Design a protein around this ligand. Sequence first.
Ligand SMILES: [Ca+2]
Lengths: 346, 94
Amino acid sequence: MSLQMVTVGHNIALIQPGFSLMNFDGQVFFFGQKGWPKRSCPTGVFHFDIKQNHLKLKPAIFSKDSCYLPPLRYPATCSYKGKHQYIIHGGKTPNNELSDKIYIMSVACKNNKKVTFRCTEKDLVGDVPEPRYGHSIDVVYSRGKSMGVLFGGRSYMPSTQRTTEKWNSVADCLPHVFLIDFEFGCATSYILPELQDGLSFHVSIARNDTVYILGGHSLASNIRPANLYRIRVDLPLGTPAVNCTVLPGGISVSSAILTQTNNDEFVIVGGYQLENQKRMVCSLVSLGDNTIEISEMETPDWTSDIKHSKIWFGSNMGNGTIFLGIPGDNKQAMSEAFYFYTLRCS
Amino acid sequence: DMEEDILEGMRSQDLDDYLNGPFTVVVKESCDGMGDVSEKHGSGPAVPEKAVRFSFTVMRITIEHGSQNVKVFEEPKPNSELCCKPLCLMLADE
Ligand SMILES: [Ca+2]
């Protein structure tokens, strides 16, 4: 809880609400810039190197057999830390159309602060989930195997009820649970009767056999379910099985950022409480063997700007460090389009 | 709006007023991001704001009389101030 303002280089405008910060061995990489990829950086990815409160967005090449992926804006990013690699699912192509491909980010070659990524296009079969954004995917382990739990987020209307006078309206996807096999890219949808209403922009914490879904926004009624869910999974010799349990003490937040401050101990920072109240309080989530425990922590001191501005975003860098953003006074002495902050958490 | 003009066109082309052939229309599409469309309401020259106007222009109308396409209508001043029908307009950088 040590806030600290940051200064950005020349290509500052690339950072936009919805950016991703992937992480490889303490080396952070910005993804999801604004506008299609330029020619000064053909791929979109960037070394997100912060030193002395100054970050240098540096271009970063791909491999020779990778696949150039568009800059998405609200993907599902899960760290399949098993040959470290990330999984990207869905998002908003700069043409405001949603995507459904899965992308796999590995590192094919590195030499003295010069990385060469490898982004491969994994496609799904079976009960493929809907092209959507705002959702959340997490890799969960069971009985020596792994699987991907994807829980719904909002999307565009289907190709039937999509009129052009409301072409951009969005509906929360049905609250299913998608189990995704990466070894074959196979999807399987399960309708947990305990999950009722649609949910997007939530927070999902995986602990080695479960998924703790928490907070989020429910557009079907414009509320924020303060509940939470524990999706227990188990992988038999044949068809997997899932169960859910509601628990008390759930936060009421959407767009809250997550990072793993300590081993089996997460922090969570402000999303939004009400459409006028940005969330200020920070909450530490003590995981464990079976029992989650959300609690409140030392209310980090927010500067004047952060208490003035009404929207604010960011993501975790990976080592208990949350990078933030603030729009900045429009009617001002040519205030920049975005100011940026960083919060350590030890 | 140009009903009367294209009726006069069919008259001039020695056709029937009461002809309902499949009139093929040829429309032009034009989008141009004009900039600095703001004005100082009070004190402070601060903010420049831009705009975009997507518009079209009915460029020609042609009926397929029998087995030939006759030009029932052609725009006199195609790229003129006052035939570019506005369609959409927004306040946003191009
Ligand atoms: Ca122009």
